[PDB]
Amino acid sequence: AQYEDGKQYTTLEKPVAGAPQVLEFFSFFCPHCYQFEEVLHISDNVKKKLPEGVKMTKYHVNFMGGDLGKDLTQAWAVAMALGVEDKVTVPLFEGVQKTQTIRSASDIRDVFINAGIKGEEYDAAWNSFVVKSLVAQQEKAAADVQLRGVPAMFVNGKYQLNPQGMDTSNMDVFVQQYADTVKYLSEK
C-alpha cells in the first residue's frame, strides 16, 4: 500500500492506554530536534493537516544535557502550566544551541522573563506541585512508549513515526510525507 507498517511508521507491541492523540518527544539539547522544529517545522506542518478534534502534545525529555536537561524538562512543564509554549520554544532552542547562552536554570528563567512572563509567575509555577506532576507525566509518557531517542512522535498511543523509512529528499517532500503519515495514522 501507500502507507506501510515498517516503512513510514511502526506499531507498538504494547499500545498505550489514554495517550495523547499526537505525542511528540523532544529535547532542547537535541540537534536533530532543533532541525525538526526550527528548520523543518514538522510540528507546524503536522498540525496544519490534523483532523477535526485532534490535538498535538509535545513533551520534553531528561536524558540529554544532565542537570540542565532536567531543568529544561521542568521549564517546559512551566511553559505548559502557563500556556506559553509558543512564546518560549524558539528562544529556548536558540539559547541552548545557537547562542549557547543557556547554561543554568537561571538562564532558562531569563528567557521567560524576556518573553514577558512575570518573575513571580514563573517562580510560583517552577516551585509548584502542578509543575512537578507535569514533569512526572512527561517522564511516565517516555516510559510508556519505551522511548529510545528523540525526536519522536506517537499517534493514538499505538503507532510510531519512522522518518528513516521516508524519503530524505528535498526537505520539503520529507516534511510533507511525515505530516501526511501523521494524518493517515490519526484516522487509523
Side-chain angles (χ1 to χ4, degrees):
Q2 286 298 343
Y3 299 94
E4 290 164 359
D5 202 324
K7 179 183 149 207
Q8 299 93 333
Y9 72 95
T10 54
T11 308
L12 289 179
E13 318 189 41
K14 286 165 168 320
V16 181
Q21 277 154 331
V22 182
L23 184 49
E24 179 184 341
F25 290 89
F26 80 103
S27 170
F28 285 113
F29 269 96
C30 160
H32 281 130
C33 300
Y34 187 102
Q35 296 295 318
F36 255 46
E37 177 67 25
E38 296 301 302
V39 182
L40 297 177
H41 305 272
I42 295 277
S43 49
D44 283 349
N45 277 285
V46 171
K47 284 188 296 184
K48 282 178 172 147
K49 299 199 169 159
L50 285 176
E52 311 65 25
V54 189
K55 189 216 165 212
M56 179 150 200
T57 303
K58 182 163 341 193
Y59 290 162
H60 196 267
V61 306
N62 293 335
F63 63 76
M64 298 183 78
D67 269 314
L68 193 48
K70 261 212 91 160
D71 284 328
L72 286 159
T73 299
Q74 187 158 351
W76 187 244
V78 169
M80 293 189 283
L82 296 179
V84 294
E85 300 94 321
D86 309 323
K87 302 181 180 345
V88 300
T89 296
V90 168
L92 290 171
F93 262 125
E94 305 221 354
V96 177
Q97 297 191 46
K98 179 191 199 178
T99 66
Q100 293 183 351
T101 45
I102 296 180
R103 307 154 192 246
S104 72
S106 181
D107 300 331
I108 296 170
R109 181 169 180 285
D110 292 346
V111 167
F112 285 70
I113 299 304
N114 192 60
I117 286 85
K118 287 180 296 299
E120 169 203 315
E121 274 191 305
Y122 182 92
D123 295 339
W126 175 272
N127 294 294
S128 77
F129 287 91
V130 154
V131 161
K132 286 321 209 163
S133 60
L134 282 170
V135 171
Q137 285 180 33
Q138 294 175 87
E139 296 170 344
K140 187 187 175 12
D144 287 348
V145 299
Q146 300 192 2
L147 189 71
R148 251 168 322 282
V150 286
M153 195 175 302
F154 299 83
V155 180
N156 297 315
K158 192 164 339 166
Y159 306 106
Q160 186 173 354
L161 278 295
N162 192 39
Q164 292 303 319
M166 304 175 185
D167 165 18
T168 325
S169 174
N170 52 307
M171 344 162 287
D172 290 323
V173 171
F174 173 79
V175 170
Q176 288 303 307
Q177 183 169 33
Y178 194 111
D180 284 340
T181 305
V182 177
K183 181 163 195 304
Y184 161 84
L185 291 176
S186 70
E187 304 165 335
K188 199 172 166 58

PDB file of all heavy atoms in Angstrom, residues 173-186:
ATOM      1  N   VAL A 173       9.617  17.470   0.556  1.00  0.00           N
ATOM      2  CA  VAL A 173       8.933  16.173   0.374  1.00  0.00           C
ATOM      3  C   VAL A 173       8.983  15.344   1.645  1.00  0.00           C
ATOM      4  O   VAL A 173       7.988  14.719   2.019  1.00  0.00           O
ATOM      5  CB  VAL A 173       9.483  15.351  -0.801  1.00  0.00           C
ATOM      6  CG1 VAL A 173       8.913  13.928  -0.810  1.00  0.00           C
ATOM      7  CG2 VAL A 173       9.185  16.055  -2.117  1.00  0.00           C
ATOM      8  N   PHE A 174      10.140  15.335   2.302  1.00  0.00           N
ATOM      9  CA  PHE A 174      10.266  14.642   3.582  1.00  0.00           C
ATOM     10  C   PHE A 174       9.233  15.159   4.584  1.00  0.00           C
ATOM     11  O   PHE A 174       8.467  14.371   5.168  1.00  0.00           O
ATOM     12  CB  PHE A 174      11.696  14.793   4.137  1.00  0.00           C
ATOM     13  CG  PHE A 174      11.872  14.248   5.531  1.00  0.00           C
ATOM     14  CD1 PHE A 174      12.016  12.884   5.740  1.00  0.00           C
ATOM     15  CD2 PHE A 174      11.932  15.101   6.621  1.00  0.00           C
ATOM     16  CE1 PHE A 174      12.195  12.376   7.017  1.00  0.00           C
ATOM     17  CE2 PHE A 174      12.109  14.603   7.908  1.00  0.00           C
ATOM     18  CZ  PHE A 174      12.241  13.236   8.102  1.00  0.00           C
ATOM     19  N   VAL A 175       9.175  16.482   4.763  1.00  0.00           N
ATOM     20  CA  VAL A 175       8.263  17.057   5.747  1.00  0.00           C
ATOM     21  C   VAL A 175       6.800  16.791   5.374  1.00  0.00           C
ATOM     22  O   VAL A 175       5.971  16.474   6.239  1.00  0.00           O
ATOM     23  CB  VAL A 175       8.486  18.575   5.903  1.00  0.00           C
ATOM     24  CG1 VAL A 175       7.398  19.193   6.735  1.00  0.00           C
ATOM     25  CG2 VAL A 175       9.862  18.834   6.523  1.00  0.00           C
ATOM     26  N   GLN A 176       6.480  16.901   4.090  1.00  0.00           N
ATOM     27  CA  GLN A 176       5.122  16.593   3.656  1.00  0.00           C
ATOM     28  C   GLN A 176       4.759  15.141   3.909  1.00  0.00           C
ATOM     29  O   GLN A 176       3.658  14.846   4.381  1.00  0.00           O
ATOM     30  CB  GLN A 176       4.974  16.893   2.165  1.00  0.00           C
ATOM     31  CG  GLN A 176       4.943  18.369   1.790  1.00  0.00           C
ATOM     32  CD  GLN A 176       3.834  19.101   2.505  1.00  0.00           C
ATOM     33  OE1 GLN A 176       2.680  18.679   2.444  1.00  0.00           O
ATOM     34  NE2 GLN A 176       4.163  20.201   3.172  1.00  0.00           N
ATOM     35  N   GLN A 177       5.687  14.240   3.627  1.00  0.00           N
ATOM     36  CA  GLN A 177       5.450  12.825   3.895  1.00  0.00           C
ATOM     37  C   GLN A 177       5.263  12.555   5.389  1.00  0.00           C
ATOM     38  O   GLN A 177       4.380  11.792   5.787  1.00  0.00           O
ATOM     39  CB  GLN A 177       6.585  11.963   3.341  1.00  0.00           C
ATOM     40  CG  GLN A 177       6.341  10.477   3.545  1.00  0.00           C
ATOM     41  CD  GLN A 177       7.309   9.584   2.784  1.00  0.00           C
ATOM     42  OE1 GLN A 177       8.475   9.933   2.586  1.00  0.00           O
ATOM     43  NE2 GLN A 177       6.824   8.417   2.355  1.00  0.00           N
ATOM     44  N   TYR A 178       6.085  13.191   6.217  1.00  0.00           N
ATOM     45  CA  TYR A 178       5.964  12.993   7.653  1.00  0.00           C
ATOM     46  C   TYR A 178       4.567  13.453   8.110  1.00  0.00           C
ATOM     47  O   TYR A 178       3.825  12.713   8.787  1.00  0.00           O
ATOM     48  CB  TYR A 178       7.083  13.766   8.357  1.00  0.00           C
ATOM     49  CG  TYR A 178       7.302  13.399   9.806  1.00  0.00           C
ATOM     50  CD1 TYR A 178       8.461  12.732  10.201  1.00  0.00           C
ATOM     51  CD2 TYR A 178       6.363  13.730  10.779  1.00  0.00           C
ATOM     52  CE1 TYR A 178       8.675  12.401  11.530  1.00  0.00           C
ATOM     53  CE2 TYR A 178       6.567  13.404  12.101  1.00  0.00           C
ATOM     54  CZ  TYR A 178       7.720  12.741  12.473  1.00  0.00           C
ATOM     55  OH  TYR A 178       7.926  12.421  13.793  1.00  0.00           O
ATOM     56  N   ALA A 179       4.207  14.667   7.715  1.00  0.00           N
ATOM     57  CA  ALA A 179       2.918  15.249   8.062  1.00  0.00           C
ATOM     58  C   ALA A 179       1.755  14.408   7.517  1.00  0.00           C
ATOM     59  O   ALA A 179       0.777  14.167   8.236  1.00  0.00           O
ATOM     60  CB  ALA A 179       2.833  16.683   7.557  1.00  0.00           C
ATOM     61  N   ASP A 180       1.865  13.971   6.260  1.00  0.00           N
ATOM     62  CA  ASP A 180       0.825  13.119   5.652  1.00  0.00           C
ATOM     63  C   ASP A 180       0.647  11.805   6.421  1.00  0.00           C
ATOM     64  O   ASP A 180      -0.491  11.346   6.648  1.00  0.00           O
ATOM     65  CB  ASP A 180       1.162  12.805   4.178  1.00  0.00           C
ATOM     66  CG  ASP A 180       0.894  13.976   3.227  1.00  0.00           C
ATOM     67  OD1 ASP A 180       0.120  14.887   3.590  1.00  0.00           O
ATOM     68  OD2 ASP A 180       1.476  13.979   2.111  1.00  0.00           O
ATOM     69  N   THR A 181       1.767  11.202   6.821  1.00  0.00           N
ATOM     70  CA  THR A 181       1.748   9.966   7.589  1.00  0.00           C
ATOM     71  C   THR A 181       1.072  10.192   8.941  1.00  0.00           C
ATOM     72  O   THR A 181       0.250   9.385   9.353  1.00  0.00           O
ATOM     73  CB  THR A 181       3.160   9.392   7.753  1.00  0.00           C
ATOM     74  OG1 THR A 181       3.741   9.231   6.454  1.00  0.00           O
ATOM     75  CG2 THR A 181       3.095   8.019   8.450  1.00  0.00           C
ATOM     76  N   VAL A 182       1.381  11.292   9.628  1.00  0.00           N
ATOM     77  CA  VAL A 182       0.667  11.536  10.885  1.00  0.00           C
ATOM     78  C   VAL A 182      -0.853  11.631  10.668  1.00  0.00           C
ATOM     79  O   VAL A 182      -1.646  11.060  11.447  1.00  0.00           O
ATOM     80  CB  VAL A 182       1.174  12.808  11.610  1.00  0.00           C
ATOM     81  CG1 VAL A 182       0.341  13.054  12.857  1.00  0.00           C
ATOM     82  CG2 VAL A 182       2.651  12.652  11.989  1.00  0.00           C
ATOM     83  N   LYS A 183      -1.268  12.330   9.615  1.00  0.00           N
ATOM     84  CA  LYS A 183      -2.704  12.454   9.360  1.00  0.00           C
ATOM     85  C   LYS A 183      -3.315  11.084   9.078  1.00  0.00           C
ATOM     86  O   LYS A 183      -4.381  10.747   9.596  1.00  0.00           O
ATOM     87  CB  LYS A 183      -3.013  13.404   8.207  1.00  0.00           C
ATOM     88  CG  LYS A 183      -4.535  13.498   8.020  1.00  0.00           C
ATOM     89  CD  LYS A 183      -4.978  14.673   7.198  1.00  0.00           C
ATOM     90  CE  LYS A 183      -6.474  14.897   7.385  1.00  0.00           C
ATOM     91  NZ  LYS A 183      -7.214  13.656   7.046  1.00  0.00           N
ATOM     92  N   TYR A 184      -2.645  10.298   8.244  1.00  0.00           N
ATOM     93  CA  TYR A 184      -3.108   8.942   7.974  1.00  0.00           C
ATOM     94  C   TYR A 184      -3.283   8.142   9.281  1.00  0.00           C
ATOM     95  O   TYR A 184      -4.315   7.492   9.500  1.00  0.00           O
ATOM     96  CB  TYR A 184      -2.129   8.239   7.042  1.00  0.00           C
ATOM     97  CG  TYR A 184      -2.231   6.733   7.035  1.00  0.00           C
ATOM     98  CD1 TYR A 184      -3.164   6.075   6.241  1.00  0.00           C
ATOM     99  CD2 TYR A 184      -1.370   5.964   7.823  1.00  0.00           C
ATOM    100  CE1 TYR A 184      -3.232   4.666   6.231  1.00  0.00           C
ATOM    101  CE2 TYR A 184      -1.435   4.591   7.827  1.00  0.00           C
ATOM    102  CZ  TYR A 184      -2.363   3.942   7.040  1.00  0.00           C
ATOM    103  OH  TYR A 184      -2.390   2.564   7.073  1.00  0.00           O
ATOM    104  N   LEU A 185      -2.278   8.195  10.145  1.00  0.00           N
ATOM    105  CA  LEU A 185      -2.315   7.441  11.400  1.00  0.00           C
ATOM    106  C   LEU A 185      -3.436   7.896  12.324  1.00  0.00           C
ATOM    107  O   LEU A 185      -4.047   7.083  13.021  1.00  0.00           O
ATOM    108  CB  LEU A 185      -0.976   7.540  12.133  1.00  0.00           C
ATOM    109  CG  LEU A 185       0.210   6.808  11.474  1.00  0.00           C
ATOM    110  CD1 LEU A 185       1.514   7.053  12.245  1.00  0.00           C
ATOM    111  CD2 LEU A 185      -0.066   5.310  11.312  1.00  0.00           C
ATOM    112  N   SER A 186      -3.699   9.197  12.333  1.00  0.00           N
ATOM    113  CA  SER A 186      -4.718   9.752  13.213  1.00  0.00           C
ATOM    114  C   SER A 186      -6.108   9.195  12.898  1.00  0.00           C
ATOM    115  O   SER A 186      -6.975   9.147  13.778  1.00  0.00           O
ATOM    116  CB  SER A 186      -4.712  11.273  13.118  1.00  0.00           C
ATOM    117  OG  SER A 186      -5.202  11.705  11.859  1.00  0.00           O
TER     118      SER A 186
END
